[PDB]
Write a protein that binds this ligand. Structure first.
Ligand SMILES: *[C@@H]1O[C@H](CO)[C@@H](O[C@@H]2O[C@H](CO)[C@@H](O[C@@H]3O[C@H](CO)[C@@H](O)[C@H](O)[C@@H]3O)[C@H](O)[C@H]2NC(C)=O)[C@H](O)[C@H]1NC(C)=O
Ligand SMILES: *[C@@H]1O[C@H](CO)[C@@H](O[C@@H]2O[C@H](CO)[C@@H](O)[C@H](O)[C@H]2NC(C)=O)[C@H](O)[C@H]1NC(C)=O
Ligand SMILES: *[C@@H]1O[C@H](CO)[C@@H](O)[C@H](O)[C@H]1NC(C)=O
Ligand SMILES: *[C@@H]1O[C@H](CO)[C@@H](O)[C@H](O)[C@H]1NC(C)=O
Ligand SMILES: *[C@@H]1O[C@H](CO)[C@@H](O)[C@H](O)[C@H]1NC(C)=O
Lengths: 122, 537, 132, 122
């Protein structure tokens, strides 16, 4: 489950999320979305078919999906989830979750170099 | 960062010096302020002499500073040097607290005083020298030893009867013109850096251990500064003496851990990274040659050494020259395609840039053979000479002009792949190189084979083109030694094909080559070609 | 401090980046990013003389500094096509905070010469404005 | 172009501005003053003559000028400008400008805003 592009974030409109599943052996799969704990109805998102991918012998398949949410819900701190059902999973389902503070940096240094010390170089 | 000069500078007291710094010749950089400043400790970088008329109190009467705008250089002279002038300095442009500078190091050594009881000889690294020693009229039947005070041991490793060191082997002799008079001598061939120090000569001994000194200085060569830019070219001039005109000479590049890496040899070596873009010329009567390197990348900058040996490698005891190269990279040379693709039967067209204010010159076009040394036979010039086997498939055009000319080569084959150079007769040459790769496919334009003609009647030749060329202009030519210019006889009838040609009486003056082409006004494009003979009946 | 991404001279901002293959945990490593802002304390808001007082507020949008809108050349099949490189360059119009060493900046002032007036032209940066 | 002295601002009657030119080789020079963007009449200021300064190398010259303006216009925020014309300048004239906020400022306010420091710079 992938975070939105920053260009979309710096415009104050709807932002977009992407789900990806790959490497599964029969072409039968289910994708659902969630917001917090509420399942969103399936007229709010677009999901493609399930096609096979170029690989080395053992045939496998892939599928994508997207979902566009409002920037105030993202910036407040509401979380979202993509959920995938397959027959070869032992508990038959998988979840991923994303929000802000996902790829936030760990260190920030700020230096205010005053006057009488300006020593930059070309 | 684009500023360059001599990194280290040495002299002695009382002598003068001359320092040169280089800058890009843009018009901001010629009219701005130039300065020489002493980067001391405790913060500042105090200016000593400037370009606007400032001379300091310590430099009064001793110095000046001259700006040469057409070179892009400026020179600093400092007379009457002392030992308090040793330190770290800076060239520069503009304001000191920015960084358009270059660091220079200057060391001044104490001269000679009241120890002048020796006769010194100076010599280049890898040459001959003599050490004269006056033989006298009684000390013949002793040993003619020669120490060298490694520490303060008297280290006799030379005797004048063959009792030599395995270190100093193969190059020491004596020659007799003594037997009573006051000289004999020893010639030392192929000196090293290791063979410096003070020599306590003798010739026999009368037992007071009476001493004679004769010291030598061996010096490593001073590099010449070369200032070039990105996508340009350089030439070195290797000018050793006529004594080594039958030895194999070479050119390495100094690396970090005392490691030359051979760029060219005379016995046929090359790096892989210089394929297509290097030349080496036959040496003159003085035994002096030149090495040309084009298409300068960023990592080409560094120290270079040219020398001579029997094998073609940097060995100790060989005479060398030096250079230091700087690639500017704030260049004004326009970018160009490096590779140009084509298919068998099709055409190419490459643009070759020169300098705009040198437009009254003659232009050339190479083919880099690269077999033995590196060699540019010409194929076509702007005078009106073409090669023999390139007849009917080569021309040089002065359009678009004003920075660029154009050369067209069609009827391609799989053996036309190679590296090609473009040359002018101007003052400073850029030499640009392009690689022609041959890929698979078929040509866009389509013409028939070679046509005949009956004894005097109308000919008609078609020439097709697809709808990607519908936006463009169509023309023909007849190829001669001075290029080609279009014809009035064409129809261009069909809206998306069939630009024709009509020759309504076949004379003998039409039996040549004809072209069918595409151009966007000034820029040229694809081309096909056919021949038209005339038979007997 | 190894590879330059942005070197902007209308705002005088420079962004570099370097993969620091750190010592501990030698199969993972960090990505460092350095930003340098030089702030002029005596420039005006518009670059003319009497505009408005000295600028006291400086704003930098990294989505605008990293922007790329000049057309490029791409060899797809056996062809040269021209493409754009950005989604947002619907348009100079940007405000500059500093000068630039390689460009003139002039002005126009009316002065009197006994009778009428003229339209005398005045150089604001004298090093870069010689006709050459 | 120099700001007024500190002790003239308290008495609140008139102030004076100084214009110095320095280090030019021929001794011919002109000086003109503006208020805002309009030229002042010649009979309102005082200019001295060009004289030769002590030597640090090449011989150079110098000249001065002063202008006295009302202390209310200095505190409204009006700007004044000094123009110098010389044979060696590129476009034959150059100028400097000053007002109340620039020169003996007694206050430095600066606010720097950086928007998206972690933002996929391509
Ligand atoms: C920042 O300041 C500059 C300099 O004052 C402004 O540019 C100038 O704007 C004026 C008024 O729009 C232009 O004057 C015009 O001149 C033409 C004749 O060329 C005349 O037809 C008009 O009636 C008017 O008088 C002037 O040309 C123009 N450009 C210069 C001086 O190069 C600019 O608009 C200001 N920008 C901002 C964002 O404040
Ligand atoms: C470019 O630099 C060269 C140095 O190689 C200058 O040549 C010398 O110029 C001085 C004049 O100050 C002469 O006295 C010398 O005889 C010149 N030659 C040498 C070998 O030193 C040259 O002047 C510079 N270019 C221009 C246009 O001045
Ligand atoms: C001043 O420059 C000239 C160059 O014309 C030079 O010959 C002379 O030695 C310089 N004077 C010094 C170093 O005192
Ligand atoms: C040559 O090129 C320059 C720069 O592009 C241009 O200003 C000039 O007009 C050109 N000359 C001609 C004759 O086109
Ligand atoms: C074209 O045909 C004529 C017919 O004899 C021949 O002499 C000539 O060499 C041909 N040229 C090419 C390039 O095939």
């Amino acid at each position: 489950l992938l975070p939105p592009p920053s260009e979309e974030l710096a415009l104050n409109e709807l932002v977009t999320l992407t789900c990806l599943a790959r490497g599964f052996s029969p072409k039968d799969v289910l994708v659902r979305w969630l917001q917090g704990s509420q399942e969103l109805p399936r007229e709010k998102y677009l999901t493609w078919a399930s096609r096979q991918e170029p690989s080395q012998g053992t045939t496998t398949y892939a599928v994508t999906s997207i979902l566009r949410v409002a920037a105030e819900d993202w910036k407040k701190g509401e979380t979202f989830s993509c959920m995938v059902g397959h027959e070869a999973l032992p508990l038959a389902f998988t979840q991923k979750t994303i929000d802000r503070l996902a790829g936030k940096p760990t260190h920030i240094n700020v230096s205010v170099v005053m006057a009488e010390a300006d020593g930059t170089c070309y | 960062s684009p500023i360059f000069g001599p990194e280290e500078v040495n002299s002695v007291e009382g002598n003068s010096v001359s320092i040169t710094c280089y800058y890009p010749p843009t018009s901001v950089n010629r009219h701005t302020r130039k300065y020489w400043c002493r980067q001391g400790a405790r913060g500042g970088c105090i200016t000593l002499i400037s370009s606007e008329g400032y001379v300091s109190s310590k430099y009064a009467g001793r110095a000046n500073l001259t700006n040469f705008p057409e070179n892009g250089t400026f020179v600093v002279n400092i007379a009457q040097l002392s030992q308090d002038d040793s330190g770290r300095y800076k060239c520069g442009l503009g304001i000191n607290s920015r960084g358009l500078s270059f660091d220079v190091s200057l060391e001044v050594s104490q001269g000679p005083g009241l120890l002048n009881d020796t006769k010194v000889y100076t010599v280049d690294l890898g040459r001959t020298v003599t050490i004269n020693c006056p033989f006298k009229t009684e000390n013949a039947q002793k040993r003619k030893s020669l120490y060298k005070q490694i520490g303060l041991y008297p280290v006799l490793v030379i005797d004048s009867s063959g009792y030599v060191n395995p270190n100093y082997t193969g190059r020491i002799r004596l020659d007799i013109q003594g037997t009573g008079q006051l000289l004999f001598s020893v010639v030392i061939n192929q000196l090293r850096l290791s063979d410096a120090g003070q020599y306590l000569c003798q010739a026999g001994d009368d037992s007071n251990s009476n001493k004679k000194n004769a010291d030598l200085q061996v010096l490593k060569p001073e590099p010449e500064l070369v200032y070039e830019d990105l996508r340009g070219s350089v030439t070195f001039h290797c000018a050793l003496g006529p004594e080594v005109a039958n030895v194999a000479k070479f050119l390495c590049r100094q690396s970090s851990g005392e490691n030359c890496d051979v760029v060219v040899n005379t016995l046929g070596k090359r790096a892989p990274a210089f394929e297509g873009r290097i030349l080496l010329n036959p040496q003159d009567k003085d035994g002096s040659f030149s090495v040309v390197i084009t298409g300068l990348r960023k990592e080409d900058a560094g120290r270079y050494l040219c020398g001579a040996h029997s094998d073609g490698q940097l060995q100790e005891g060989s005479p060398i020259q030096a250079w230091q190269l700087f690639v500017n990279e704030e260049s004004t040379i326009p970018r160009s395609p490096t590779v140009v693709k084509g298919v068998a039967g099709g055409s190419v067209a490459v643009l070759c840039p020169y300098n705009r204010k040198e437009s009254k010159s003659i232009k050339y076009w190479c083919l880099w053979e690269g077999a033995q040394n590196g060699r540019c036979p010409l194929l076509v010039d702007s005078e009106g000479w073409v090669k023999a086997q390139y007849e009917g498939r080569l021309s040089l055009l002065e359009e678009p002009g004003n920075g660029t000319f154009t050369v067209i080569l069609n009827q391609l084959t799989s053996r036309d792949a190679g590296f090609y150079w473009c040359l002018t007769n101007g003052d400073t040459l850029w030499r640009t190189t392009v690689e022609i790769k041959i890929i698979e496919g078929e040509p866009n334009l389509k013409v028939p084979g070679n046509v005949t003609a009956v004894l005097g009647e109308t000919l008609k030749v078609p020439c097709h083109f697809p709808c990607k060329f519908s936006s463009y202009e169509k023309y023909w030519c007849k190829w001669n030694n001075t290029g080609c210019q279009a014809l009035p006889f064409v129809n261009c009838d069909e809206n998306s094909r069939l630009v024709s040609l009509t020759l309504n009486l076949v004379t003998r003056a039409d039996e040549g080559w004809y072209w069918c082409g595409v151009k966007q006004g000034h820029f040229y494009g694809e081309t096909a070609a056919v021949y038209v003979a005339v038979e007997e009946r | 401090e190894r590879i330059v991404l942005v070197d902007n001279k209308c705002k005088c901002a420079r962004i570099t980046s370097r993969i620091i293959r750190s010592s501990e945990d030698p199969n993972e490593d960090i990505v460092e990013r350095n930003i340098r802002i030089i702030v002029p304390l005596n420039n005006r808001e518009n670059i003319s003389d009497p505009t408005s007082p000295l600028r006291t507020r400086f704003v930098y949008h990294l989505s605008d500094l990293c922007k790329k809108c000049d057309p490029t050349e791409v060899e797809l099949d056996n062809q040269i096509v021209t493409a754009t490189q950005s989604n947002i360059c619907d348009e100079a119009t940007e405000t500059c905070y500093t000068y630039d060493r390689n460009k003139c900046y002039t002005a126009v002032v009316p002065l009197v010469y006994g009778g009428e007036t003229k339209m005398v032209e005045t150089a604001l940066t004298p090093d870069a404005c010689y006709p050459d």
